[PDB]
Amino acid sequence: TQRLANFLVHSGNNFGAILSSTNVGSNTY
Amino acid sequence: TQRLANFLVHSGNNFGAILSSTNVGSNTY
Amino acid sequence: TQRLANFLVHSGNNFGAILSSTNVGSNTY
Amino acid sequence: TQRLANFLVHSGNNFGAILSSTNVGSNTY
Amino acid sequence: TQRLANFLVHSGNNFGAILSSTNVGSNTY
Amino acid sequence: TQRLANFLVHSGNNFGAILSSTNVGSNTY
Amino acid sequence: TQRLANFLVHSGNNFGAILSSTNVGSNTY
Amino acid sequence: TQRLANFLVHSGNNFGAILSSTNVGSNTY
Amino acid sequence: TQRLANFLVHSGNNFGAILSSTNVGSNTY
Amino acid sequence: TQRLANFLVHSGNNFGAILSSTNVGSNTY
Amino acid sequence: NNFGAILSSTNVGSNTY
Amino acid sequence: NNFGAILSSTNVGSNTY
Amino acid sequence: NNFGAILSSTNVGSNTY
Amino acid sequence: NNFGAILSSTNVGSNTY
Amino acid sequence: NNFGAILSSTNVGSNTY
Amino acid sequence: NNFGAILSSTNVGSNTY
Amino acid sequence: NNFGAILSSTNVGSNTY
Amino acid sequence: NNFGAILSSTNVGSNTY
């Protein structure tokens, strides 16, 4: 059982998520 | 059992999600 | 059992999702 | 048992999903 | 048992889905 | 323009969905 | 324009969703 | 424009969602 | 433009979500 | 523009979320 | 007289998991 | 007279996990 | 007379985990 | 006379974990 | 006469963990 | 000699939104 | 000799929003 | 000789928002 992962990212301008996990509620009652 | 994954991304301008997991509720009651 | 996956993406301007998993509720009660 | 997959994408302007999995509720009660 | 798959896509302007899986509810009660 | 809807449900044991909207990806690349 | 909706549910044991909206990714790359 | 909604739920034992919106990633790279 | 919503819930034992919005990542890289 | 919402909940034992918004990462790199 | 809807549910028994 | 909706739920029993 | 909604829930029993 | 909503919930018993 | 909402909850019993 | 796959994409132009 | 896959993408131009 | 995968991406130009 062997798992290998490789990631290479190049970003000029970032306004969002890269390799990220985001949670937002924004709920209304 | 062997799993290999490779990722290469080039982004000029990012406004969304790249290799990301996002959750948004935006619910209304 | 062997699994190999390769990904190469080039993006100018991103407003959505690339290699991403997104969840949105936007429900109304 | 061997599985091989290769992906190459070139995107100018993205407003939707590329290699992505999206879920949206948008339900109404 | 061997499975090989290759994908090459070139996109100018995207407003929908490319190599993507999308789910939308949009249900009404 | 008038819309009227009425729902009545009686459930002993639930393992699935009742009056629900579910989305599952379970995709593989 | 008028919309009226009524819901009545009785549940003994719940393991799933009742009047709910659920999203699950469970994707693999 | 008028919208009216009424909900009544009786639950013995809950292990899932009632009138809820849930998001789960559970993704793998 | 008028919106009216009414909710009444009775719960013996709760292990999940009632009238709630939950987000969980549980992602792996 | 008028919005009215009413909530009434009775809980014996609570182990989860009632009228709540919860976020959990639980991610792994 | 009914000009709307009448829904009746009656269950006699027990639920065991 | 009913011009709306009437919903009735009656359960006689016990729930055991 | 009802021009709205009437919802009635009656449970007779006990819940044991 | 009801032009709104009427919600009633009645539970007779105990909850044991 | 109701032009709003009426909510009633009645529980007879005890909760034991 | 090819026993696999060869995919070639060539685009000459510009994309304007 | 190729027993796998070769994918080539070449774009000459500019992207303007 | 290739028994795996070779992916090449070449972009000549500029991105302006």
Place this chain on the structure above:
Amino acid sequence: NNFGAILSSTNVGSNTY
């Protein structure tokens, strides 16, 4: 000789917001 993967990305230009 490749029994794995080879990924190459080349971009010539500038990004302006």
Place this chain on the structure above:
Amino acid sequence: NNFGAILSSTNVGSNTY
């Protein structure tokens, strides 16, 4: 000889906000 992975990224330019 590659039995793993080789990743190369080259960018020539500047980023201006």
